[PDB]
């Protein structure tokens, strides 16, 4: 599924991400835009042989099992394919564990380079929340 901007904002809010660990909703919408262009089916392969999955591009080296990343962890205890569903629950629940792991949203490279320090509230402008 390719989400609309306000559609995604509303879904993330319903799943408890607004101000989760101090990160306003606009941060999460901005990260999703630049990680996946709001597409739940996005995949990308890394140089080390791991793969990033879904709307928040969660990495198989650490967070999910795809059966082809030798010597990796499965810290969210889920198949990576679960992160590609049109229902964002699995992606959101795993993201909560990631952002709590020490580095906050710096775990998302595109957030650090394209969202951090910008006016992230603009990503939720006009939405009925």
Ligand X SMILES: CC(=O)N[C@@H]1[C@@H](O)[C@H](O[C@@H]2O[C@H](CO)[C@@H](O[C@@H]3O[C@H](CO)[C@@H](O)[C@H](O)[C@H]3NC(C)=O)[C@H](O)[C@H]2NC(C)=O)[C@@H](CO)O[C@H]1O
- Binding residues for Na ion, per CB under 5 A? 60, 65, 69, 72, 74
101 among the known binding-site residues?
A: yes
> How far apart are the C-alpha atoms of 31 and 28, rounded to whole Å?
5
102 makes contact, choosing from Cl ion, Na ion, ligand X, none, with CB < 5 to 8 Å by partner type, with ligand X
72 makes contact, choosing from ligand X, Cl ion, Na ion, none, with CB < 5 to 8 Å by partner type, with Na ion
> How far apart are the C-alpha atoms of 64 and 13, rounded to whole Å?
24
Residue 98 binds ligand X (CB under 6 A): yes
Tokens 């992606």 sit on residue: 91
> How far apart are the C-alpha atoms of 64 and 110, rounded to whole Å?
20
103 makes contact, choosing from ligand X, Na ion, Cl ion, none, with CB < 5 to 8 Å by partner type, with ligand X
Q: Which two tokens stand for residue 105?
A: 């949203």
Residue 116 binds Cl ion (CB under 5 A): no
User: Which residues fall in the annotated binding site for substrate?
Assistant: 101
């Amino acid at each position: 599924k390719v989400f609309g901007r306000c559609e995604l904002a509303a879904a993330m809010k319903r799943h408890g991400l607004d101000n989760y660990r101090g990160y306003s909703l606009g941060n999460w919408v901005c990260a999703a835009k630049f990680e996946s262009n709001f597409n739940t089916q996005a995949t990308n392969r890394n140089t080390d042989g791991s793969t990033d999955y879904g709307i928040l591009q969660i990495n198989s080296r650490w967070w999910c099992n795809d059966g082809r990343t030798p010597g990796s962890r499965n810290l969210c205890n889920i198949p990576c394919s679960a992160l590609l569903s049109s229902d964002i629950t699995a992606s959101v629940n795993c993201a909560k564990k990631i952002v709590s792991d020490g580095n906050g949203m710096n775990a998302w490279v595109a957030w650090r380079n394209r969202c951090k320090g910008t006016d992230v509230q603009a990503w939720i402008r006009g939405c009925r929340l």
